[PDB]
Structure formats: structure tokens, C-alpha cells
Amino acid sequence: EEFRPEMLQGKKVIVTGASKGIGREMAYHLAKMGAHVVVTARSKETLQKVVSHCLELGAASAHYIAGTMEDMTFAEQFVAQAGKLMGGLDMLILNHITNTSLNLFHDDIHHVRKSMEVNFLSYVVLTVAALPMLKQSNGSIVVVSSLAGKVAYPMVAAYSASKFALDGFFSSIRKEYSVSRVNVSITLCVLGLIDTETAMKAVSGIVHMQAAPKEECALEIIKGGALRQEEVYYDSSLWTTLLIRNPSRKILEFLYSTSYNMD
Amino acid sequence: PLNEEFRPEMLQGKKVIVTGASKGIGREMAYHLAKMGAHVVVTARSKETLQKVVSHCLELGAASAHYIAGTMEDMTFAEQFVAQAGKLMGGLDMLILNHITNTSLNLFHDDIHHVRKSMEVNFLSYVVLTVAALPMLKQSNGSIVVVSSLAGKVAYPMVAAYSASKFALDGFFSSIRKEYSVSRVNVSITLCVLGLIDTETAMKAVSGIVHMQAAPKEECALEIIKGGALRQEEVYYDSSLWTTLLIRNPSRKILEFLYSTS
Amino acid sequence: NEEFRPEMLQGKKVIVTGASKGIGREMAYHLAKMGAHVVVTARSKETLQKVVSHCLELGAASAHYIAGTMEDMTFAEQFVAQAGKLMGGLDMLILNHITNTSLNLFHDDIHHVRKSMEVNFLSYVVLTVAALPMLKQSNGSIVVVSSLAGKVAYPMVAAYSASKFALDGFFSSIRKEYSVSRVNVSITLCVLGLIDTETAMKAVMQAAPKEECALEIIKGGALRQEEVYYDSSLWTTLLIRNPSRKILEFLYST
Amino acid sequence: EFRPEMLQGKKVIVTGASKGIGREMAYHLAKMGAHVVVTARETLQKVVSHCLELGAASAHYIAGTMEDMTFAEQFVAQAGKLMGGLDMLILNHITNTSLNLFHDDIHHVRKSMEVNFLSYVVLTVAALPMLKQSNGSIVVVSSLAGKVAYPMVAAYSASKFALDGFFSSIRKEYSVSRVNVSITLCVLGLIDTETAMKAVSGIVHMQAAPKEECALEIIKGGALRQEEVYYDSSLWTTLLIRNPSRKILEFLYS
């Protein structure tokens, strides 16, 4: 069955990194469809604006909780506070990333580590905190990832490590869930260049290729999440999105799906 | 890569670090390297097992053989280990990154400690060891060998934390190889993708759960070294040597080639 | 955009070639049970009468046979004209016959190569050409039976494999021609592994069931699928797909 | 790795050598100092003389139509006599073709199959004793259309696909029977040949590679005893043509 805006009507959603970029755009779509949303990011000032607009858009309710996802206590506590405020949770959209520039890896281990903590580890912590509420609603988890979390790109090594780790972690637990019969879907989003302020300021110097619109991106993420799709692909090039599928991975996974015996 | 056949003489007098070399694949690499007449420095936590590896290496024919014991959970050890290892041999030609944190098969529930420890031991420390070794490797136009798994190319249930860390290795080191191509760094990076190998540890952890043909650790070890010496980008090793034909990704090579002009 | 149910063949007008034995005979039986009109062909006149009588028994709307050799292109063309006359049209053309073949090393057997190409490939084109007006009348379907050896190289089946490869290239090309020209005739290529037919079991390895093979060919044809895969091993069937070929056709489409 | 030394003094046949890629192959072989025999249906005399100007060890022609299988078998015996043996058989000729939707042109399908495929098998059968003696090479020229479906070239595509099925199957027969003759299938994208440019202008919107390098890459591949040789304008494309799932399935080499 196709996508219909009424799927999100009165759904309780969390969106992280929702103060700008694709995250903000997702908050607004959900707002228009009349969902309950809790947005988060570090900056209370920009979050206050996302919230007022979400209200003007017709969100069933909108609120923010500010803090840094470098802090795993905040991450864990935020999900509880969000869930209690809404009276449950049907969808968790994991979107935030730590600030990153294009540069050749030098000696910047602290940045590799910060990338792994914010972009990967916090997502695991947020998922654990949310799973009980999601099991209750038979809800879904949306993980926002990149082309560089599927293939190798220079200039983004710390950031690619962390997005590859997302695919590794979440694709493994999706298999775990389907045998444990946990009715929580996990959707991985693989995005090419998207025209967000920070992306444009980060890349527009070095490389360049055509950036897709953030507003359509955001909407395509929500729909893959709504339709319990395993992977969402989104780029300006149709070539790229055809090429990003990995049929041989799919083959190996079925091949090996028999050679274990679990209960 | 080098357009030529592997010959053991390629490693004679070469200066090599092997991590997690107290047992399993790591120990067999040290032995192979010793038989070939390389200088070897091995590491792991177990002082006592490391001493035994060193003794066999010396009588096997190593130009020289030493060990330094410590935990790769400690990023200060990792960084110092490499400095100390390069002092022992007078430089470094190959760095083989092989160790991993003790892990066993389990459904993920809420062990964030374990996910964290995995990322630190199986991923972060490899970055730290690589930063420390790069100067020495540049002086010798040498090689980095990163040992990985099937579960670092495809999803596999029960190894979620481990798989996260091995995927991250592909992502990090594959990106650095691109960067080494742009900036003209003559240090090869070989990522090894292994199926089930019959190591003590693996055999106990998967017994009764997975039902697969385990391949021989001795041959596995040699293929890794050969891969490294021939400066291959990837090495594939599995008992079912046809499976290794799937795991290569031409769409990925194409997108990497395609975006190479942006 | 659907799933299969036997009732899709009820009242359909279906030609089955190579229907005197093996898979083709099973296909005719399946179609009879589904209540189709069936015109069967093969060389064996006396065997075909027996196939026809049992098809009636089973519930075919009607059943007829016409005997002849598909080495004769004039027979191929006349057969289709007469099959259409007996049925009042045509909904599905199942092209299944092959010439007699053994596993053998290739030395100097040009005559076997040519004959393979004639019977296994060229007769399929002639029958298609003759059937096309009617299949256009009906928005019908062409079902081409092929082989693993028509996708990949196998020693000892060189002439057979040349003819099965040729089928893929010929019917896959016109299939794209029918898209662009908006001809609503589907083309199904069935790629099959070892099947437990009397002929194959002697000539030759895990053999899949012929009865179940026959139904799967019909299903793909009925659902208007581009390719159908059938082997005793699920592993083999996963691998027969070629995503890369799909990309390149997707590519060159512009 | 390849060096022009490799072909100095080698006895080579080039078919369809009176125009385009074929002609260029003779020239390269001439600048390499090879014995060439070239064939086609006059212009061969022009080609044979220019081969001498470029310093071929010898340069001869035999004119005929590869529609005639008697000619084909005779031409090779003749050519083998003239050079006293054969090292490389380069099969390059094709029948004249146009871009066109297939409708009811069975004669063209038949002609294509005879000239483009059956003749290549006739030439190989006649060449096999000599190529065995000299541990030689067979080089088959094929196309994108011989690996993927492509509208407008159905007949051609069938014949090219048939070359792949046939020659890759015997390649594997040669290995298991330890016959030390190599087989090189060349898969070419669009080349800026005089027939191809006239045939596809205004219809295929594609970048054409040059005649010169194509011939050389063809020659190198066969000199180097490579299984397949891809050549197209697109650096892009050529990573997708390789089919690992085919490789894997063939590894029911058992």
C-alpha cells in the first residue's frame, strides 16, 4: 500500500538535529501532517523557532528539549522525557551529526572519537532508551546516513567510519529483530549531496555536484519510515541511486541466513 | 598492487608489527613472518603467551623477535607501543592490525558498554596505531594491513557491536586510501575480509550456533601477509572460495570512480 | 502487479510446443486442468493423441494436436495458422521444443550446431512471427523455455548453449522494442536448471521435479514476468539474476 | 604484459578485413611484422599492398562471401597453406545490418546467424589442427549487444549472444581436455567505424571510440590470451560487464 499523509496523523515522533537542515525540514512535514513532535539539538534559540512554526503548521503538539548528544546521560534522559510528554512514541528519527569540515585526516583522533560518539554511539543509546515504547506501538526507527556510509570518499574519513558503523550495527539488529519477532522497523537512509546550509558551506569550496532539495529529502525519509522500508536512497542523480543498491550483499545475507540456529 | 607472484623473500629483513599475536591468526602471521626471516614485534595483553610466541619465532628463523604487552583499550599504550616497537627494529615496513576485544554471540539488548569497548578496541586503537606508525611507514614506503570480516561487509545477527566496528574499519581505511592517492603517500592499505577461521576463540564462541566450514588459520595467515606484501586493496579468504567472488562490489568501485572527478 | 491463481488460464487459448513428453507434456496437463484451450505439437503423432485425450479427461476447454518437425520452417508457420483456427485466436505461445542432443565434446560437428540453431532458435522466431497478429489481438504472451546453459558456459553442451544464448539476445531485444512501440505482448524467458525428465536424466546434479517446473513456467507466463528461474537449489536461482545487465540496459536506455 | 615483439613472425588470419576495425587490425599486424592473410568479398588488394609498405613478413588476400560455408572451410586451408601454419584466427566479419524494429524479417535473422555465427564455427573447425600445432589463439569480435539486450539490433544481438554461448562453452571444453588454444571474446561498445557511424547516426546518442586503438586492444587481448576484452568510450561501463554470478555458477565445475 502507497504512502498517505494520514499515516503520521497524531503519531508521536522524535526528530534529532531538528534545529536546521534536513532535521528541521522533517519536523515541518510532520507538523503539517498533524503529528506530535519533540525536536532536539544543542541550541535552544533555534529550537524555539522550529517549535513555533511547527505549531503554525498544524502539529498536534510540538516541544523541544535541548542538549548535546556527546552526553549519553542526556541522550538517555531526553528519550524518557520526550516519551512521557507525548504519552508514548511511534517513530524515532535519528539525524544529528557532530560539526565536521572537509579535510585530509591528519592526527585528529579526538575528532574520529567525537564522530563515533555523536554520530554512532548516541544513536545506539537513543534506541535502547526508546525500544520499550517502540515495542508497545510496534513503531519504527529511522537512521539517516550518507553515500559516504556506503562507499569510500576522501576528505570525510572520521565521518565515513561512523556512518558505515551505523549500517553495520543497525542492519545486524534488524536481522536480530526479525527472528526475535520484535515488531519495530529499522530504516536506513542513504543520502547524496543535500542543499542544507552546513553541507553547502562545507563542500561548495572543494568538490561540486548537484545538491538535491532538503525539503524533498526530508519528505522521502519520513515516507520510507512510514512504509517500514529497509533502505531509502536519495540523490539528485538517478544513476547514483541505481548504483547504490547492493544485490550481492543481499545474496550473501540470504545465503548465510540459514547457517545459524537461534531461539 | 605489485604485478608479480608472491615469494617469501619479499619479507626477508622486513620490519613488521603484528597485533593480537598471542593466539589465532595473529600468532600464525608471526610464525610465517619468522620463517621468512623478518624482524617481528608482537603484542597482546598476555605476557606469558607472548613470550612463547617470541621463542618459537626466534627458532623459526626471525631476524629478530620481541613482544610488548598491553591493552589496546588504552590509547596511550597503543601510541607508545608503536614508538617502542620501531626502536626495537630500527624502523617499520608493515603494520598488521589484527586484535579484537573478547566478544561472544548474543542478541543486542542494552550493552552500551560492550558497543563502546568494541569501537575502542577494534576500531579507535587501529586509528591510533596507524597515526603512530605512518611516519615510519612513509620512510620505507611500507604497508598497513587491517584484518576484518564478512560481518564487516554484510549484516550478521548476534555480532552487532563487532560488525559496527568492522564496518567502521572499512569506512575509515578505505577513505584514507583515497586520501593517500590524492596526496601521493606511498603506503599501501590492505583490508582483509575473512569468513569463519578455525581459531580457538572463534570455534568456542560459535559452537552450536553457526554451522559453517571453518577455514585453516595457517593458510589464512599466509594469504593476509601475501595480500599485504603485494599491496592489494582487498584480500578475501573463506573455506567456500566462491563466496569471495560476491563480496567484491563493482557498483561501489564505479561510484568511487564516478565521484573521483568532483 | 498481482499473484498467481490457476483461474487466469481458464478459457485461454494456448499453444504448447515440444508437448509430447517432458516439461511440455506437463505444461499441457496443467493447462488442461486449468481449463484452457490447448493445441499441442511435436513429431510424435501417436504420443500426441494420447496427450490430447488425457488433456480432455483433465478438463481442457478443448485440445488438439498437430504433428510435424520444427526443422521445417514452413510447418512452423502453417502450424500456427491452423492452431489459431482451431482455437479462435491465441493468448499464449509456449515455445519449448529442442532438438535431440547429447553431452559431447565439440570436435567438427557443424551439422549439429546448425540443426540446433534451426530447431532450438530459428523455429522460435518463425513461430513468434506467425503468432504475433493474434497475440496482438489478445494482448497475449510469449513464453520462451531456456536453460542455465543459456546464461553461462558449460562444457559438452556447446551447440545447445549457442542456441539458448541466441534466444536470450533475440527475445530480450524485441522485448524492449515492444515497450517503446507500445505492443502489449509480454515476453517471458524461463531459465531452468536440471529437471527430472526422462530425456535429460539419460543424457546427463540434483534434478528438480518436472510437474512443478511446468507450473512455474506457466505462472511466469501468466504474470507477464520477464524472466523465470527454476532449479532444485534456491542458491542457483538467486545467482541467475543479473543486476549489472539490468543497470546497463537501464543506462543505455537514453 | 604486452609487446609488439609478440606478433613479429606470427601467422594470422583476419576476416572482414576490408574496412573498419578489421582493416585496422591488419595494419597493426603489418607494423608488427606479422604474416597476414585477409579476407572479404579489390579493396583487399589495396589492403595487402599497404601491409607491405608497413613491413609485414608477408601479405596475401583471398576474396569470398562467408555466406558460403564451403568457401569458409576452403579459405582457411588455402590461407594455412600460404603461410605454412596459423597462430591467430581473428574473426571479425559481419553481414550488412541496419537499425530497425523487427517485424517479419526472418531472412535477415537467418542471414545474420549464418554469416555472424555459423561461419565463425566453420572457420574455427578448419583452423583447429593448425592452432593446436602452434599453441595459438582464436579471437572472436563481439559487442555490447552480445552481453545485454538492445532494441533495434535483434538479429545481430542473437548472433553475438550465440558467439558467447558457443565459444565460452568450448573454451571450457579446451581446458578440461587440455587443448592449448586460447579464446578471446572482445566486447565492443560503439566504435567510430564508417559502417557503424552511418548505421547509428541520429538514432544512438553515444560517444564513439576510435578505430585505431580498438584494433590494437583487440590484438593485445588475443596476444595476451585474455578470456574477454572490453572496449568502449566509457571508462564507466566496463566494470559492470564482468559477471561474478556467472563465474560462480560455472564453478559447478564438478
Ligand SMILES: NC(=O)c1ccc[n+]([C@@H]2O[C@H](COP(=O)([O-])OP(=O)(O)OC[C@H]3O[C@@H](n4cnc5c(N)ncnc54)[C@H](OP(=O)(O)O)[C@@H]3O)[C@@H](O)[C@H]2O)c1
Ligand atoms: N546535507 C547533506 O549533503 C547530507 C548528505 C548525506 C547525509 N546527510 C545526513 O543527514 C543528516 C542531517 O544533516 P544536515 O546537513 O541536515 O545537518 P545540519 O544542517 O548541520 O544539522 C545538524 C543538526 O544536528 C545538530 N547537532 C550538531 N551537534 C550536535 C550535538 N553534539 N548534539 C546534538 N545535536 C547536534 C545541529 O544543531 P546544534 O548545533 O544546535 O546542536 C543541527 O540541528 C546527517 O545525519 C547527515 O549525515 C546529509
Ligand SMILES: NC(=O)c1ccc[n+]([C@@H]2O[C@H](COP(=O)([O-])OP(=O)(O)OC[C@H]3O[C@@H](n4cnc5c(N)ncnc54)[C@H](OP(=O)(O)O)[C@@H]3O)[C@@H](O)[C@H]2O)c1
Ligand atoms: N577467527 C575467525 O573466524 C575470524 C573471522 C572473521 C574475521 N576475523 C578477524 O581476524 C582477526 C583475528 O581474530 P582471531 O579469531 O585470531 O582472534 P583471537 O584468537 O581471539 O585473537 C585475538 C587477539 O587479540 C588479543 N586481544 C584481545 N583483547 C585485547 C586488547 N584489549 N588489547 C590488545 N589485544 C587484545 C588477544 O590476546 P589477549 O587476550 O592476550 O590480549 C589475541 O592475541 C580479528 O581481527 C578478527 O576480527 C576472524
Ligand SMILES: NC(=O)c1ccc[n+]([C@@H]2O[C@H](COP(=O)([O-])OP(=O)(O)OC[C@H]3O[C@@H](n4cnc5c(N)ncnc54)[C@H](OP(=O)(O)O)[C@@H]3O)[C@@H](O)[C@H]2O)c1
Ligand atoms: N530437462 C532439463 O534438465 C532441462 C534443463 C534446462 C532447460 N530445459 C528446457 O526445457 C525444455 C523441455 O525440455 P525437456 O527436458 O522436457 O525435453 P524432452 O523431454 O526431450 O522434450 C522435448 C520435446 O521436443 C520435441 N521435439 C524434439 N525434436 C523436435 C523437432 N525436431 N521438431 C518438433 N519437436 C521436437 C519432443 O517430442 P518429439 O520427439 O515427439 O518430437 C519433446 O516433445 C527445453 O526447451 C529445454 O531446453 C530442460
Ligand SMILES: NC(=O)c1ccc[n+]([C@@H]2O[C@H](COP(=O)([O-])OP(=O)(O)OC[C@H]3O[C@@H](n4cnc5c(N)ncnc54)[C@H](OP(=O)(O)O)[C@@H]3O)[C@@H](O)[C@H]2O)c1
Ligand atoms: N563498429 C562498431 O561500432 C562495433 C560495435 C560493436 C561491435 N563491433 C564488431 O566489430 C566487428 C567489425 O565491425 P566493423 O564496424 O568494423 O564493420 P565493417 O566496418 O562494416 O566491416 C565489416 C567487414 O565484413 C566484411 N563482410 C561483409 N559481408 C561479408 C560476407 N558476407 N562475407 C565475408 N565478409 C563480409 C566487409 O567486407 P566486404 O563488404 O567487402 O565483404 C567488411 O570488411 C564486428 O564483429 C562487429 O560486430 C563493431
Ligand SMILES: C[C@H](NC1=NC(=O)[C@@](C)(C(F)(F)F)S1)c1ccccc1F
Ligand atoms: C553532512 C555531509 N555528508 C555527506 N555525505 C556524503 O556522502 C557527501 C560526501 C556527499 F553527499 F556525497 F557529498 S557529503 C558532510 C560530511 C562531512 C563533511 C562535510 C559534509 F557536508
Ligand SMILES: C[C@H](NC1=NC(=O)[C@@](C)(C(F)(F)F)S1)c1ccccc1F
Ligand atoms: C571473530 C569472529 N568474527 C566473525 N566474523 C564473521 O563474519 C563471523 C560471523 C563469520 F565468520 F561469518 F562466521 S565470525 C567472531 C565475532 C564475534 C563473535 C564471535 C566470533 F567468533
Ligand SMILES: C[C@H](NC1=NC(=O)[C@@](C)(C(F)(F)F)S1)c1ccccc1F
Ligand atoms: C535439456 C538439457 N539442458 C540443460 N541445460 C542446462 O543448463 C543443463 C546443463 C543443466 F540444467 F544445468 F544441467 S542441462 C540438455 C542439454 C544438452 C544435453 C543434455 C541435456 F539434458
Ligand SMILES: C[C@H](NC1=NC(=O)[C@@](C)(C(F)(F)F)S1)c1ccccc1F
Ligand atoms: C556494428 C554495430 N554493432 C553494435 N554493437 C552494439 O552493441 C551497438 C548497439 C553499440 F555498440 F552499442 F553501439 S552498435 C551495429 C550493429 C547493427 C546495426 C548497426 C550497427 F552499427
